[PDB]
Design a protein around this ligand. Structure first.
Ligand code: YWM
Lengths: 99, 99
């Protein structure tokens, strides 16, 4: 689809079999979701945002469907204020900016 | 133009008579720029994201040129680690997400 930006570009995603709402975020290198239960192993990591660094659980090679488009990649889970889909997954679904 | 998201969507902007580099950020409601001493009145504000909140100064009706596209709106100035063009200005240059 073509998504204008008068509202937050929020979309439904499916991860771990569960539906959630997330923000298409071209300013995020990575995908960071609010704390949730996901199956499989994970590794601790640090990520920095506008206000500082937080601790997250890094899940590699995770199946995630974004607005009807499938991706398999890295998902960070931690105390983010907002579920954000970052460029690591936006590239997988073929997302570009256009003006 | 079309901007792929393999790398950060960095572009040259002109603001307050200066050239700077900023991210085209669909995940930002508003525009936040590195410390710069712009003329005129402003209002203090607190903005938050990953890692917490930072203090910024809100300037209204600021002229910005983004890839040759002119816009005018609110710009928040403060100790941000990156310059982000947010949706308040991206809409004015006709920017969309497409996949
Ligand atoms: C020198 C480098 O410093 P640094 O690395 C941090 O750099 C960066 C910091 C922020 C960004 C932009 C930010 N992206 C990320 O947070 O992405 C995370 C995850 O992926 C990683 O890639 C980039 C960072 C990591 C979002 O696009 C926009 N945000 C909102 C989202 C979270 C809902 S917002 O910024 O909070 C914000 C809040 C309010 C407003 C107005 C009020 O509406 C405007 C903008 C990009 C790089 O370390 C610092 C300790």
């Amino acid at each position: 689809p073509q998504i204008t930006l008068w509202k937050r570009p929020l979309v439904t995603i499916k991860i771990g079999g569960q539906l959630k709402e997330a923000l298409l975020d071209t300013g995020a290198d990575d995908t960071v979701l609010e704390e949730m239960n996901l199956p499989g192993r994970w590794k601790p990591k640090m990520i920095g945002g506008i206000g500082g660094f937080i601790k997250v659980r890094q899940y590699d090679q995770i199946l995630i469907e974004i607005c009807g488009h499938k991706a398999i990649g890295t998902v960070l889970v931690g105390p983010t204020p907002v579920n954000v889909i970052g460029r690591n997954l936006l590239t997988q679904i073929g997302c570009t900016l256009n003006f």
